[PDB]
Paper text:
Enhanced ABA levels elicited in response to drought are perceived by the PYR/PYL/RCAR family of ABA receptors and the clade A subfamily of protein phosphatases type 2C (PP2Cs), which act as necessary ABA co-receptors in ternary complexes. In the resting state, PYLR/PYL/RCAR receptors display an open ABA binding cavity flanked by two highly conserved loops, named as gate/CL2/β3-β4 loop and latch/CL3/β5-β6 loop. Specifically, both gate and latch loops define a surface that enables the receptor to dock into the PP2C active site. The formation of receptor-ABA-phosphatase complexes causes the dissociation of different PP2C-SnRK2 complexes and abolishes PP2C-mediated inhibition of the SnRK2s, triggering ABA response.
In contrast, a fourfold increase in the IC50 of ABA was determined in the synthetic receptor compared to its WT. The synthetic CsPYL15m receptor displays a similar chain of stabilizing interactions as AtPYL10 along the five mutated residues (left and middle). First, we selected a dimeric receptor and designed a series of mutations that increased its affinity for the synthetic ligand while reducing the affinity for ABA. Therefore, we did not observe constitutive activation of ABA signaling in vivo, which otherwise could be detrimental in the absence of stress.
Author numbering:
A (entry chain B): 186 to 225, 227 to 273, 280 to 505
B (entry chain A): 21 to 207
Write the structure that this text describes.
C-alpha cells in the first residue's frame, strides 16, 4: 500500500484562515487482528500500515482546528496503543476507538483533560482556545485492507467506487431530523436564523471544542468501517467550502478525470520516488477542484485532500 | 403607545428581597416604548464582586471584548473621549449569523452605573437594537455582591417570530453576562 495523495488548502475571500489539514503517511501499525480474520493466508502478515488524513474546518477562531492538525492523530495513535494491550466486533471496536479519540481531544481543547508535558511531570490543564471556538473534523485511515472514516460536523469524505460516489459520512446539521430530536432531548433549541442553528448561533450539531454549547453540540462522531474494493477509484476529504458549490458526484469524477489526464500527458513517475510526498496527478486534481470552487464563487476557506486508490493507471 | 412590563415579573436569578430594590431601576431604566413587530426581554446576573469594579469593566465602551463574547476586533474612531454619541466598529468572529456591527454609546452614567448602547449599522439581523446595563450593589452581613441587569429592545426580522428573536438575543446576553461574572470575580 503506497500512499497517493494531493492537497490544497486556501483562505479565499475570508479575512481569516481557519481551515487546517494533516496528512501522515505510514503513521500507524494497525494490528491485523483489527482488520480481518485469519483464513487459509500469510504468516508474515501480522500488522498493517495505516495512513492518516484529516481536514478540520474551524469556526470562531483557528486554534481548535490548528490543534486538531497538530494533535488528533497522536491522540488516535495512543488509543490504538491501549488496545494493543488487549485484556463484526471490529466495526464497534473502531467505533469506540474514534469515539474515545475525539472525546479525548474535545476535552483537551475545553481544558477538562490535562495535556501532556515534555518534562514528564503534571499534565498541563488549560483550555486551548476561548469558549466560543470550535472546529469540524473528518478523518480517514487508509490501509491496504480497509478505509475507516470518522466524522464530526459538516466536512465530508466521499468515496468514488466504480461510477458511484458514496459519501462516507453524513453532515451534522442542526435541521437533520435525528439531530433536531437529539438537541431537544438534551434541552436545547434549534431555530432558523440565516440557516438552522443551535440557539440561533452555531450552524452545526457536532464539533470539536465549542465549550459554551456543551452538551448540545457534541464531539461524538459517525464512524464508517469500509472494506476496500478493486473498483475503488479515489477518496476525497474536504471542508464545505467545496461541497457548498459542488455536487459529490461531480467532484469525484473531476478528480478522476484530472488524475487520468495527468497520467496520459506525463506517464507514471519513478516507482522508487512514489509514496514520499504528494502524487503529481492527485495534486493536479486538488488544484483543479479548488480553482473551480473559487470561480463557481465560493467565498469560504476551501481545503481538499485527493487520494488515488488505484494501484496502477 | 405601548411599553415593556419587565417590572411585573421577577427575572431569573434574583431573590424576591433583591427585586424589591431592583424593581425600581427596572421601571427607571429597563422600560421601552414598543413599536409594532418588536420585542424585548430583561436579564439579570448575580456577580460575587463589588459593584464598582463590575461597573469599572462594563463602562469600557472601547474594550467590549474584555467582558463580551463573539468579538474578533473592535475599533473606535481615533479621537475618542468615551462620551455619549461615540461609536465603535465591531468585527465578529466566524460562524455566526453576523459579521459586523456599528454601535453608538447612548447612555453613560457613572453616577448611577448604567450603560446604554444602540446598534446603528453593520451586517446582521438585529435591526434597531438598544440595550441597557445597570449595575446594582448589595450588602448582606458584610458580604458585598453585585446584581447586573441588562435589557434590550429590537425589531423582529422578516421570517422569524418574537420567541426566536428573544431566544437568540437572550442566549447571547446570558453568555455575555456569564463572562462578565468570570472577569469581575477574577479581580
Ligand atoms: C454577537 C452578535 C450577533 C448578532 O447577530 C447581532 C450582533 C452583531 C449585534 C451581536 O453582536 C449581538 C449583540 C448582542 C445580542 C448584545 C450586546 O452586544 O449587548
Ligand atoms: Cl471574512
Ligand atoms: Cl482562535
Ligand atoms: Cl475500544
Ligand atoms: Cl429548524
Ligand atoms: Cl474534468
Ligand atoms: Cl494534466
Ligand atoms: Mn470555518
Ligand atoms: Mn465540546
Ligand atoms: Mn456551509
Ligand atoms: Mn467552512
Amino acid at each position: 500500500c503506497i500512499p497517493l495523495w494531493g492537497v490544497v488548502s486556501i483562505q479565499g475571500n475570508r479575512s481569516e484562515m481557519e481551515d487546517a489539514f494533516a496528512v501522515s503517511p505510514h503513521f500507524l501499525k494497525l494490528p491485523i487482528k483489527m482488520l480481518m480474520g485469519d483464513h487459509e493466508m500469510s504468516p508474515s502478515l501480522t500488522h498493517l500500515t495505516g495512513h492518516f488524513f484529516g481536514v478540520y474546518d474551524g469556526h470562531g477562531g483557528h486554534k481548535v482546528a490548528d490543534y486538531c492538525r497538530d494533535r488528533l492523530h497522536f491522540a488516535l495513535a495512543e488509543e490504538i496503543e491501549r488496545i494493543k494491550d488487549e485484556l463484526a466486533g471490529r466495526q464497534v471496536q473502531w467505533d469506540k476507538v474514534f469515539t474515545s479519540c475525539f472525546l479525548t481531544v474535545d476535552g483537551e481543547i475545553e481544558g477538562k483533560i490535562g495535556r501532556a508535558v515534555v518534562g514528564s511531570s503534571d499534565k498541563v490543564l488549560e483550555a486551548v482556545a476561548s469558549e466560543t471556538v470550535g472546529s469540524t473534523a473528518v478523518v480517514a485511515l487508509v490501509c491496504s485492507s480497509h478505509i475507516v472514516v470518522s466524522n464530526c460536523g459538516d466536512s465530508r469524505a466521499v468515496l468514488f467506487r466504480g461510477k458511484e460516489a458514496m459519501p462516507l459520512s453524513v453532515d451534522h446539521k442542526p435541521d437533520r431530523e435525528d439531530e433536531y430530536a437529539r438537541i431537544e432531548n438534551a434541552g436545547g433549541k434549534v431555530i432558523q436564523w440565516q440557516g438552522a442553528r443551535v440557539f440561533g448561533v452555531l450552524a452545526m450539531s457536532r464539533s470539536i471544542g465549542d465549550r459554551y454549547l456543551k452538551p448540545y453540540v457534541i464531539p461524538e462522531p459517525e464512524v464508517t468501517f469500509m472494506p476496500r474494493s478493486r473498483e475503488d477509484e479515489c477518496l476525497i476529504l474536504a471542508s464545505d467550502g467545496l461541497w457548498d458549490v459542488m455536487n459529490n458526484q461531480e467532484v469525484c469524477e473531476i478528480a478522476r478525470r484530472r488524475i487520468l489526464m495527468w497520467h496520459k500527458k506525463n506517464g507514471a513517475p519513478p516507482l522508487a520516488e512514489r509514496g514520499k510526498g504528494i502524487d503529481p496527478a492527485c495534486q493536479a486534481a486538488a488544484d483543479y477542484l479548488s480553482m473551480l470552487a473559487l470561480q463557481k464563487g465560493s467565498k469560504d476557506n476551501i481545503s481538499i485532500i485527493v487520494i488515488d486508490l488505484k494501484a496502477q493507471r | 403607545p405601548t411599553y415593556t412590563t419587565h417590572h411585573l415579573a421577577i427575572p431569573s436569578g434574583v431573590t424576591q428581597d433583591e427585586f424589591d430594590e431592583l424593581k425600581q431601576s427596572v421601571v427607571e431604566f429597563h422600560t421601552y416604548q414598543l413599536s409594532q413587530n418588536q420585542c424585548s426581554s430583561l436579564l439579570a446576573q448575580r456577580i460575587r464582586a463589588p459593584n464598582d469594579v463590575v461597573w469599572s469593566i462594563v463602562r469600557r465602551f472601547d474594550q467590549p471584548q474584555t467582558y463580551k463574547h463573539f468579538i474578533k476586533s473592535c475599533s473606535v474612531s481615533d479621537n475618542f473621549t468615551m462620551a455619549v454619541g461615540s461609536t465603535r466598529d465591531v468585527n465578529l468572529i466566524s460562524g455566526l449569523p453576523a459579521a459586523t456591527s456599528t454601535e453608538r454609546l447612548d447612555i453613560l452614567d457613572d453616577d448611577r452605573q448604567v450603560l446604554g448602547i444602540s446598534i446603528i449599522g453593520g451586517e446582521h439581523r438585529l435591526r434597531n437594537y438598544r440595550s441597557v446595563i445597570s449595575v446594582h450593589g448589595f450588602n448582606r452581613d458584610g458580604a458585598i455582591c453585585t446584581v447586573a441587569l441588562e435589557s434590550y429592545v429590537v425589531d423582529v426580522p422578516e421570517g422569524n417570530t418574537e420567541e426566536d428573536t428573544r431566544l437568540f438575543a437572550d442566549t447571547v446576553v446570558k453568555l455575555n453576562l456569564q463572562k462578565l461574572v468570570s472577569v469581575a470575580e477574577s479581580q
